[PDB]
Amino acid sequence: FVSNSEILKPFEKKQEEEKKQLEEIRGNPLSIGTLEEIIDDDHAIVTSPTMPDYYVSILSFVDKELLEPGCSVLLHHKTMSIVGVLQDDADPMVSVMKMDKSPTESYSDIGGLESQIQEIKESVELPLTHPELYEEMGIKPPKGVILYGAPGTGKTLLAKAVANQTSATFLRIVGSELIQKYLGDGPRLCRQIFKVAGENAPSIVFIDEIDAIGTKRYDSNSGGEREIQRTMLELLNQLDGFDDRGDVKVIMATNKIETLDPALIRPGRIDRKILFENPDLSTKKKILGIHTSKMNLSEDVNLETLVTTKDDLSGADIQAMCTEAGLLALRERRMQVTAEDFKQAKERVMKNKVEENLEGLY
Amino acid sequence: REMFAYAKEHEPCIIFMDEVDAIGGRRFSEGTSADREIQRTLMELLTQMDGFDNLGQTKIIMATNRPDTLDPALLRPGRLDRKVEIP
Amino acid sequence: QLPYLVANVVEVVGKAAVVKTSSRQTVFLPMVGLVDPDKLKPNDL
Amino acid sequence: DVGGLDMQKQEIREAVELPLVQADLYEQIGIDPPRGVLLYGPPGTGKTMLVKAVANSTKAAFIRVNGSEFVHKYLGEGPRMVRDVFRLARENAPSIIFIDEVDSIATKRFDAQTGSDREVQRILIELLTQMDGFDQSTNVKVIMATNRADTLDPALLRPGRLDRKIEFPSL
Amino acid sequence: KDELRLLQEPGSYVGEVIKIVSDKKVLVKVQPEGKYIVDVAKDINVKDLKASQRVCLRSDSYMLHKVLENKADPLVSLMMVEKVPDSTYDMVGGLTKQIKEIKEVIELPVKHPELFESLGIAQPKGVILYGPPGTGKTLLARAVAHHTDCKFIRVSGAELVQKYIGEGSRMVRELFVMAREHAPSIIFMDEIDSIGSTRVEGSGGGDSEVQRTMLELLNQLDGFETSKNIKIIMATNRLDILDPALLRPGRIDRKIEFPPPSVAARAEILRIHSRKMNLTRGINLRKVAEKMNGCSGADVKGVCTEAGMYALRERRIHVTQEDFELAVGKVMNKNQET
Amino acid sequence: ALMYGPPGTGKTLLARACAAQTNATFLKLAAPQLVQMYIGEGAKLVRDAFALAKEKAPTIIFIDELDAIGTKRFDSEKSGDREVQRTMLELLNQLDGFSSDDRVKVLAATNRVDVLDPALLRSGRLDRKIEFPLPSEDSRAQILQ
Amino acid sequence: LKQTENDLKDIEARIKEKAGVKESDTGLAHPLQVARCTKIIKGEDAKYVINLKQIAKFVVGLGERVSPTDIEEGMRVGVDRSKYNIELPLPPRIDPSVTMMTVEEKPDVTYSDVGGCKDQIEKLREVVELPLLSPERFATLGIDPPKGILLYGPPGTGKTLCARAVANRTDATFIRVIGSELVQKYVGEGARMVRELFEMARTKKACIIFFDEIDAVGGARFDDGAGGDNEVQRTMLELITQLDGFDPRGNIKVMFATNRPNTLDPALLRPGRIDRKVEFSLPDLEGRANIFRIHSKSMSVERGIRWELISRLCPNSTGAELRSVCTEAGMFAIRARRKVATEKDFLKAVDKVISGYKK
């Protein structure tokens, strides 16, 4: 404040003359365009939302490094030339990016999933800690992991559990967001995933819930979209072309692999297919600890009693078990849930899945 | 519709249809899977005849493979009064 | 003017003609002497 | 114009001419008139032409609607016209809306047919909203002819908004 | 004379303020056109510009003119918000099990939201009705937004999606804008409803375009916005071609079924609809429901019109006991006719 | 003229020999192009075939795999063949349009003949059936020579 | 010091851009996918203004007009997917992405997946190795090599590596065109890339041009007649005319690859397009005996083992799946604390990939 009063204030007065020549080129009737390709001859392609696709020349405002193909810029109504670039801080460039460094989930906190740990540890932690073991065999360790089951137990816990021991940064990317709202950004978002995580790379990319883009059907038309093929074809080249010592890792998740593109699978690059395992007594107590924390319970309520007799429910039915237990207190007009409500609600959810399996077989 | 209007505006007009089994027919269960164009043509032919605007001098000739495979609603009197075999 | 507008003539009363442009616009114009009624047909330039 | 229709003629007079002429008979009894009637039988024979004869005695505006209409490759225009024709009949009390062979537009989908068949269940919600959605008030008479129907009962049957069901006598 | 000079205008578009620029400009998204950077009015400071603020942009010079009221003008297909809803729970009354399940789900968090936060369970934001078709749920739908003093809103997913460019997105996002300002309201989800009120058996082939938008706005509203007192009410009796992920939390919370019909179920319904009518003293309304077969709530409601037709031929406002059983026998045979 | 026989006997090879001596334009109709995912493409395809043959008079149309589009049977299962059904229907309609032009030839080389039709046998359509059997002892000696 | 020179590029040049650039951009104005002007009318002659947009289309007649640089406005002048009348010379189809393919001259890979299969070797020795070595004997022989080679079967099994094996002894340049990268959203680029293949092949002779998974883009589809984009149509015109008629096939070869042989272009099934046809089958115990021995040469393992028993544990399967077995050999050996793969290491490694296929 005091230091910059004798610096920035006389600086803006001497720089006011250069700002006057800018505003003359700027103009009041501006517009937002869309970039396509940038060439060293100072020319580009811009489009306003009414789709009058144009081709104009690039003037001198900001460095070309700030300009990227597929972005939005500023235009004027005379020559439709680019008068400036639009700030991308408000509009996220990628789909969903969440950087979690050193997460809480570890191998010992996920319960009896250790059977799945031995498979993911050899394909992730083993090449990272001892890369010289693969150099003697001359083989490429698979960087991909295929996950099965339902979220909240197998997919949610194991995703952040591998990053703790490997000291990796967890990045969660939504799979249904791979087709994003715009045409031409398919190959751009694929490179930004490996570009941001490529400089340092103590990170593992995670993708979940792809029901769509993995299916190109029989064509790109008659109900299909071109954005689906832009991301799928570029993801195959970026995954197969980029090879490293095991720093960058990309892990997807899907319930059914029969609908996915077999060419996108690229056999031999991803050798790891991990099935879904049922939770043990340790994992089931972890799900209960989250919901029963805010839920009122007496001193006679123990997590070991509920998991003793159970149908071995998934993460969806366990969450619904404590949900039904809360309705018994609302009908009786009480804020304290006793131990009888947890046992009564456990039998109702257990009987809604498997009972007699249509008794038979002589 | 435009053929119905062109027949009213210009009296000397004769309409001839060939192989109406494609646009007609009872199909199987009378359900529609990509079949909406079959009922689209049949319902319009029966609706223009029973409306308040009829065709006095306009004659429409239809042809098909079998008469029994068509819509029985058209064969009833009041719209199509002429059923003639060609042996 | 050499670059004429691309359209199709749907109707050749006798000296009147109707043309349908490819811009989803329909205009009415009288027939001139530089064209023939057989030369005006749809699916043509 | 055609005899032997006294079975159907007594049904039309009660569901059309009765609420149109004297509206005070319903308030005295404490009952409300139905918002429509379903006609089952072959069209064109003692049926379709009889519907046009209703506008003669009632002196009402007859709206001719075909089930093969509103065919388009776009969306949103078809379902919008069902609401617009209802409000169009609200300004003019003597109005009558008729639909020929509702069996084509009342057929639902037991399986997903993907393209080009999506418009059969999109048009059904608007016909039901203009009747089952609103309360009971009749500014117009709704008559739906049916040539043949195996099972179509999406909301249509039961006397929620539609009480009487007319059937063409064979004997 | 001064008015004639004011009536001449080049025109002004409609847009909403997005952000604020240090260059004394503003980024405003024009709904019929798009995002355009324009100039802020000289008589209006840039500090008063907020996010999603409704303003007025001139057509001629493409700049801010004045600041109108802040509202989202709805494009109206079936979605127009009505006023003064007319219904009651005494008209659809007579069902004990259904009313208890509706109050503990919809009406409970609205009146006392602190009961769920103190207990430690999230309040249900949605419910799917179950039951046979034509139980009389069409009349109680108006009473849901009436007794709760909420805004009556009906949503049609078909009319908000069009094959035209830009017409299948902005319409769906228009619902999300007003849902925040109207938040004390209950949203009605139609076209998926199999309950029988309006039953199309759902649409799995026509929703392929809207699933990429509407399903994102409904899930982001609860999770990201955390806006309470907003009830998304869906209905169906079966999940087959719809979203298989609805069973996950955030969409389906509570499930309200329908009680089996019996003599005691139709005895109270017949008495309610007969209050507007006039009955002779000494007529038992419970014996009428005993002779009924497979009659739902709407079957009894339709008997009133049929019962008044027999007495109208004799021109009597009072329906004798002889005409009731003759009318009920005809209404019961409507489904079994031919 | 109708032509049937196994492939390799010259059914597709001799099709150009008739247009070479008569100075006619060879127009081939591909078999998979007749199968279209869009419904209603058979009407414009047949009309455009004779439209190009109207401007250029010496034009011969060659059809490949006649048996694919040549069997409707009697059944109601045509819902999947609905594009194939109207293909033969428009063929009968366009050939009746201009009866004064004999310079437009329609040739279909297929394996055999199974489903007949009274409409397909008449003037301006397939009439003479020329069998293409397997070559005999002395026939293979002349071909190999 | 350098702070002024950094902003000097955007200051001093901006003054010249006011008069200079605005004058060059007058008239409402390197791959360009949209060629259109806005309200440009001149005269009669020198008007042009061809608009590809659906609104206000135009065409230009009156003979042939060719300009070296500027036709009317220069710049946006273009054609793209719809060819308008008589003007070839200025397509905006040039995308300097043409290096996307893989050109390998004299590949050093000899026997990789080729060993073990006798039938596929002998079929490609006569039509490839011989003409690329002594083509003069074929001029005396009287006949010509086949215009095309049809390779159909499971992909990634060595179908591509089989062309690299025969090209080793002849020192031929191996050019592979991947069908996955061949399919692009840009319409009109496929016609230029194929034309540049034969033009570049004449510069350096003794090369082999290979195409992978031709059914990806397809030789015959429903988008040719019904659709409005021209890709395969103009590709087949440059494929048949350039190669067959004026170009000798001795030093220039074109080999395709596919899966279903009946889904190809029926134009290629006619005589005079594709003659040589080689069928690929799953390798037997003898076929896979030499496959595992080649891959094990790169890795360091125990030489006292036998690879004929390893190939017996796995049933008949595509050769592309055999590469994943070697990647699992050096993994389970680490769990046993063995830097090399012993005899017992391949026992659990082969049994792991068998249960993963679930066939």
Swiss-Prot record, chain A:
Q: Which UniProt keywords apply?
A: ATP-binding, Cytoplasm, Isopeptide bond, Lipoprotein, Myristate, Nucleotide-binding, Nucleus, Proteasome, Ubl conjugation
* Any single biological process term in GO: peptide catabolic process
**Ligand binding (ATP):** G149, A150, P151, G152, T153, G154, K155, T156
Principal localization? cytoplasm
Mind naming one GO cellular-component term on file for this protein?
Answer: nucleus
**Compartment(s):** Cytoplasm; Nucleus
Known outcome of mutating K155Q = 73% loss of ATPase activity
**Quick check: keyword Cytoplasm in the entry?**
yes
Q: Where is this cross-link: Glycyl lysine isopeptide (Lys-Gly) (interchain with G-Cter in ubiquitin)?
A: K160, K181, K216
Which molecular function term from Gene Ontology is one that the record holds? ATP hydrolysis activity
As for family, the record states: Belongs to the AAA ATPase family.
The record describes the protein's role as: The 26S proteasome is involved in the ATP-dependent degradation of ubiquitinated proteins. The regulatory (or ATPase) complex confers ATP dependency and substrate specificity to the 26S complex. Has ATPase activity.
Q: What is this protein called?
A: 26S proteasome regulatory subunit 4 homolog
Record organism: Saccharomyces cerevisiae (strain ATCC 204508 / S288c) (Baker's yeast)
Which lineage?
A: Eukaryota, Fungi, Dikarya, Ascomycota, Saccharomycotina
Full-protein interval shown: 75 to 436 of 437
Curated annotation (Swiss-Prot), chain C:
Show the coiled coil region(s): none
Source organism of this protein record: Saccharomyces cerevisiae (strain ATCC 204508 / S288c) (Baker's yeast)
Q: Which residues form the signal peptide?
A: none
What is the protein's given name? 26S proteasome regulatory subunit 6A
Q: Which cysteines are joined by disulfide bonds?
A: none
- Localized where? Cytoplasm; Nucleus
Q: What kind of modification does the protein receive after translation?
A: N-acetylated by NAT1.
Q: What does this protein do?
A: The 26S proteasome is involved in the ATP-dependent degradation of ubiquitinated proteins. The regulatory (or ATPase) complex confers ATP dependency and substrate specificity to the 26S complex.
Q: Which family does it belong to?
A: Belongs to the AAA ATPase family.
Question: Encoded by which gene?
Answer: RPT5
Curated annotation (Swiss-Prot), chain D:
Query: Could you name the domain of life of the organism this protein comes from?
Result: Eukaryota
Where do the annotations place ATP binding? Answer: G41, P42, P43, G44, T45, G46, K47, T48
Q: Where is this cross-link: Glycyl lysine isopeptide (Lys-Gly) (interchain with G-Cter in ubiquitin)?
A: K108
PTM comment: N-acetylated by NAT3.
Locations listed in the record: Cytoplasm; Nucleus
Q: Which residues cross the membrane?
A: none
- Family that this chain belongs to: Belongs to the AAA ATPase family.
| Function field | The 26S proteasome is involved in the ATP-dependent degradation of ubiquitinated proteins. The regulatory (or ATPase) complex confers ATP dependency and substrate specificity to the 26S complex.
Q: What is this protein called?
A: 26S proteasome regulatory subunit 6B homolog
Residues shown, of full length: 173 to 343 of 428
From Swiss-Prot, chain E:
What modifications follow translation? N-acetylated by NAT1.
Where in or outside the cell? Cytoplasm; Nucleus
Q: Which UniProt keywords apply?
A: Acetylation, ATP-binding, Cytoplasm, Nucleotide-binding, Nucleus, Proteasome
Q: Does the keyword ATP-binding apply?
A: yes
Q: Which gene encodes it?
A: RPT6
User: According to the UniProt record, which cysteines are disulfide-bonded?
Assistant: none
On subunit structure and binding partners, the annotation says: May form a homodimer or a heterodimer with a related family member. Interacts with OLA1, TMA17, and UBR1.
Question: Can you supply one Gene Ontology CC term for this chain's record?
Answer: nucleus
Which residues does the annotation say bind ATP?
G131, P132, P133, G134, T135, G136, K137, T138
What name is this protein filed under? 26S proteasome regulatory subunit 8 homolog
